[PDB]
Write a structure and sequence with these properties.
Chain B: Keywords: Calcium, Calcium channel, Calcium transport, Cell membrane, Disulfide bond, Glycoprotein, Ion channel, Ion transport, Membrane, Metal-binding, Phosphoprotein, Signal, Transmembrane, Transmembrane helix, Transport, Voltage-gated channel. This is part of a larger assembly, with chains A (48 residues) and B (973 residues). Chain A is mainly alpha-helical and 48 residues long. Chain A is 44% helix and 0% strand. Classes of the chains: A mainly alpha (48), B alpha+beta (973). Chains A and B meet through loops of A and helix 7 of B.
């Protein structure tokens, strides 16, 4: 929530559901990155 | 350097030779005398320029009334018929049969969708519609993204089927009637007569986006004017998706405004400011809206939200009254996403009495609260919209015209007055039209006061078109000279009728296309703007024309004779002429009609030959078989009879005219007898000239051709071989040199074009033309223009015989008022004849402008084709320069310096023509060139709108408008 919270302000129309905008969503995203599933997509959103 | 006296004797002999050649070879006095010789085959009738304006004003008022009476018929039947509809929700059994336009006319498809059934129409081909129409039933258009098969759509197709009898009866009472359309509030448009839509959505690769709810005739008849203030929220939390949705939404909202409404876009993030240069409400025309769109696209999101500051700014913008407004609907459109403040104190302070509406839009896909925004919308008589994607934009940004029309509905029968729109280009490819509109009200359970819930919205809008080729038939222009004309005007300045109003969109700025961003097959939209060309942008603008414009915007009738500059047909010259503007108001409507007549055109010739013998003799003289005796003859494509058609290939037309004047007896029952009688008498006079006088001296020394252009539309080029190099228009009222030679009182020289495709400088010659002026009973009359093509080579021979061929000590040039090279001294100049002098020798040209031998005037052409810049043809504004003779002085002796140089020159103006002669020290001696003084359309963008809004042109808005009824409901939000 600190690093990427409210920084997914991308001006396209692609939906990035795994963001870090509030606490339940950040918990979901971190869990998904723990199970390993598609952690690279979250990383690319973070790097962009 | 030669002296002024030797120079002056040179030019005196030069003008003597040129003028005597043109006079004796063209044959002006001959034509004058053979006009004044007969004087009993014709009569001289007057042009009472007050009577003419009043007759044409009544004819226009009658036409618009006939169209009005066909609108109330439609609206009455539509209200009465929907008042008795059942609202069934089953149709799979009881089908609705109807002809859906934009369905493939391939009879092997058999779609006949569930619930509905198609029609295979017959589609005869018609004129008055340059397409194939069927007068049997009405066609239906449904937007591409609206299913035809909803219960809402199938219920509109079920009760609108009662309109076809009214459509047919309207069309049978007046067969000259163009489209009749009912545009419904569900998206449908039912029009008559039936005709396939221009675009099938997907059958070709061009998909169409046409919604009736956004056509300006609809938006015009569906609500009163406004005083809108868009209030964009650019706090930080909107960044990302919702910000770009906000940009697209504000643009698509600005596109639902007219020239009657006023707008401004503000913007707040912990501080409210204007998005652009404007700072108050501006008139929402095409230029201002371009400014506001370009300003909204430059918007960035950063900061903390503060709704109180934004709403203070908005409500203080809506209280200016130091500026011009619409004064009717004060509304605020808040484009936001969401938040937690509602700002009750601002609304309680500023619109405690609820004169302003608030429409709030929640854009994007987010999680912020939306309670307060709905409350703002519901607490302030407004409405609440949600825009989650790009597809929702179009339908959610045009839907506030349902809220704005509840007071119109409640006003009852005072609200049904026919209105006429600006001039726009028809969607079914018909040209410029104006539309008359009238809203249709929903009266269901009306006689007992049962429902009154859905009975606060209109059903749709009725409309009937009136082309401008139909208005220009009530103002027949063939009894005035090529220089007089009718023109009408809005109560807004804009022009409804003008010789300078073409069928192309008004351009704004310079166009810039990006090739590298344009996919090949994505169907970018084309245009939807009206053709709103102001009056002071269709003519040259004096200080007197401003007062005439103001004086006839508020319906006064008057007359004023003055002296003005008149830009020539081809934009290269400028004349000075005496004109008379006589104007009156069109009594039924708000329009105003004016007639421009140059004195010398207060009298015309009316032919008086009815005898078979004379008429037959004359009609013989225009037949190709014997051009050898009369020289190539052209005929104007006028409308002599409703049987033959203008053909744009004039040999075909002359042949048809002949075979018709014979093949149809001289009774001519369906033919305009004054037109063809004038043409016949005219060809008689012209041929007398050609036979008796021209054909004697078969070959003159320097002459290359000899022509006669006249009224009645006859043109004669003497050696038939010359008739192949004649490029002028065959309709004489569009010949530039004709209108120019009528203005001047001397021999007008027309310079050729340069680097133009075609034999145009050497094979043809230089055109001299003088207008015939005859006196019948003390009355001046200019009925013809005689002319000549001088051969360049014989001219050079007479010109060179202290400056000699290619001499490198001085130049000897001849120009015409306009600065176009005519006769040089260099064989390197003379190669570019007809080119603007300041483009070949700019220092001397700029000096000539400085000492004021040449003045100039600049103007803007708002309807031009443009080569898109880098940032196939677009529409842009071009700037046009034109030079002319201001100081009537004859000689100018001086020295021009560029610094360490010196060139001494002498210029002298030939008398009885429009030619000037310059002898100047050479140019190669002094290596000093500044920059080309270009006279050509240069693509530009000015003027600057940020300054016109501070001193705007006078304007008078509608006085009937419906806002703030008391029985309004506003439990809908």
């Amino acid at each position: 929530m600190q690093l990427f919270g409210g920084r997914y302000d991308f001006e396209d129309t692609e939906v990035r559901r795994s963001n870090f905008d509030n606490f339940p969503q950040a918990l979901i995203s971190v869990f998904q990155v723990l199970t390993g599933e598609d952690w690279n997509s979250v990383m690319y959103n973070g790097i962009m | 350097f030669p002296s002024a006296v030797t120079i002056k004797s040179w030019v005196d002999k030069m003008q003597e030779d040129l003028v005597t050649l043109a006079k004796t070879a063209s044959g002006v006095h001959q034509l004058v005398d053979i006009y004044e010789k007969y004087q009993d085959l014709y009569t001289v009738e007057p042009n009472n320029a007050r009577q003419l304006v009043e007759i044409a004003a009544r004819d226009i008022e009658k036409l618009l009334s006939n169209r009005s009476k066909a609108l109330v018929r439609l609206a009455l039947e539509a209200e009465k018929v929907q008042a008795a509809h059942q609202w069934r929700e089953d149709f799979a059994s009881n089908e609705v049969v109807y002809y859906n336009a934009k369905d493939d006319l391939d009879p092997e498809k058999n779609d006949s969708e569930p619930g509905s059934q198609r029609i295979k129409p017959v589609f005869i081909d018609d004129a008055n519609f340059r397409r194939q129409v069927s007068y049997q039933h009405a066609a239906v258009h449904i937007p591409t993204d609206i299913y035809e098969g909803s219960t809402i759509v199938l219920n509109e197709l079920n009760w609108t089927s009662a309109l076809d009898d009214v459509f047919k009866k309207n069309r049978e009472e007046d067969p000259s009637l163009l489209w009749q359309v009912f545009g419904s509030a569900t998206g449908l448009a039912r029009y008559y007569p039936a005709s396939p839509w221009v675009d099938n959505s997907r059958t070709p690769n061009k998909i169409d986006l046409y919604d009736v709810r956004r056509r300006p005739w609809y938006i015009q008849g569906a609500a009163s004017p406004k005083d809108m203030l868009i209030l964009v929220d650019v706090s930080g939390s909107v960044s990302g998706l919702t910000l770009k949705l906000i940009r697209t939404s504000v643009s698509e909202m600005l596109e639902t405004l007219s020239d009657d409404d006023f707008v401004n876009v503000a913007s707040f993030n912990s501080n409210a400011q204007d998005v652009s240069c404007f700072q108050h409400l501006v008139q929402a025309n095409v230029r201002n809206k371009k400014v506001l769109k370009d300003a909204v696209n430059n918007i960035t999101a950063k900061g903390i939200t503060d709704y109180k500051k934004g709403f203070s700014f908005a409500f203080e913008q809506l209280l200016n009254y130091n500026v011009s407004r619409a004064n009717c609907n004060k509304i605020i459109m808040l484009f936001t996403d969401g938040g937690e403040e509602r700002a009750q104190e601002i609304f309680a302070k500023y619109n405690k009495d609820k004169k302003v509406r608030v429409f709030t839009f929640s854009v994007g896909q987010h999680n912020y609260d939306r309670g307060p925004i709905q409350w703002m919308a519901c607490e302030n008589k407004g409405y609440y919209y949600e825009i989650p994607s790009i597809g929702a934009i179009r339908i959610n940004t045009q839907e506030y015209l349902d809220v704005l029309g509840r007071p119109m509905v409640l006003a009852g029968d005072k609200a049904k007055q026919v209105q006429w729109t600006n001039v726009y280009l028809d969607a079914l490819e018909l040209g410029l039209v104006i539309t008359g509109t009238l809203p249709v009200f929903n009266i269901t359970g009306q006689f007992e006061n049962k429902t009154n819930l859905k009975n606060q919205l209109i059903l749709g809008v009725m409309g009937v078109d009136v082309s401008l080729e139909d208005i220009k038939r009530l103002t027949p222009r063939f009894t005035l000279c090529p220089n007089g004309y009718y023109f009408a005007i809005d109560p807004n300045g804009y022009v409804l009728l003008h010789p300078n109003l073409q069928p192309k969109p008004i351009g704004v700025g310079i166009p810039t296309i990006n090739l590298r961003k344009r996919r090949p097959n994505v169907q970018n939209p084309k245009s939807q703007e009206p053709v709103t060309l102001d009056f002071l942008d269709a003519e040259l603008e004096n200080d007197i024309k401003v007062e005439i414009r103001n004086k006839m915007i508020d319906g006064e009738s008057g007359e004023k004779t003055f002296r003005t500059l008149v830009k020539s047909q081809d934009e290269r010259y400028i004349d000075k002429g005496n004109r008379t503007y006589t104007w009156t108001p069109v009594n039924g409507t708000d329009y105003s009609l004016a007639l421009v007549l140059p004195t010398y055109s207060f009298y015309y010739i009316k032919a008086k030959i009815e005898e078979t013998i004379t008429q037959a003799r004359y009609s013989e003289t225009l037949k190709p078989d014997n051009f050898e005796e009369s020289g190539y003859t052209f005929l104007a494509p006028r409308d002599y009879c409703s049987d033959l058609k203008p053909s744009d290939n004039n040999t075909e037309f002359l042949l048809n005219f002949n075979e018709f004047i014979d093949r149809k007896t001289p009774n001519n029952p369906s033919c305009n007898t004054d037109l063809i009688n004038r043409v016949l008498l005219d060809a008689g006079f012209t041929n007398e000239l050609v036979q008796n006088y021209w054909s004697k001296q078969k070959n003159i020394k320097g002459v290359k051709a000899r022509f006669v252009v006249t009224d009645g539309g006859i043109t004669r080029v003497y050696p038939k071989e010359a008739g192949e190099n004649w490029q002028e228009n065959p309709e004489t009222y569009e010949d530039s040199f004709y209108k120019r030679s009528l203005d001047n009182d001397n021999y007008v020289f027309t310079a050729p074009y340069f680097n133009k495709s075609g034999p145009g400088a050497y094979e043809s010659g230089i055109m001299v033309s003088k207008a015939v002026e005859i006196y019948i009973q003390g009355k001046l009359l200019k009925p013809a223009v005689v002319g000549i093509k001088i051969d360049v080579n014989s001219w050079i021979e007479n010109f060179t015989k202290d400056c000699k061929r290619n001499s490198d000590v001085m130049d000897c040039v001849i120009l015409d008022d306009g600065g176009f090279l005519l006769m040089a001294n260099h064989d390197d100049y003379t190669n570019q004849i007809g080119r603007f002098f300041g483009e070949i020798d700019p220092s001397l040209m700029r000096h000539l402008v400085n000492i004021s031998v040449y003045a100039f005037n600049k103007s803007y052409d708002y309807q031009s084709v443009c080569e898109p810049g880098a940032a196939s043809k677009q529409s842009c504004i071009t700037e046009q320069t034109q030079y002319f003779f201001d100081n009537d002085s004859k000689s100018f002796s001086g020295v021009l310096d560029c610094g360490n140089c010196s060139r001494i020159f002498h210029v002298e103006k030939l008398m009885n023509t429009n030619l000037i002669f310059i002898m100047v020290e050479s140019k190669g001696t002094c290596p000093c060139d500044t920059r080309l003084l270009i006279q050509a359309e240069q693509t530009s963008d000015g003027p600057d709108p940020c300054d016109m809004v501070k001193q705007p042109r006078y304007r008078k808005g509608p006085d009937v408008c419906f806002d703030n009824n008391v029985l309004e409901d506003y439990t809908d939000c």
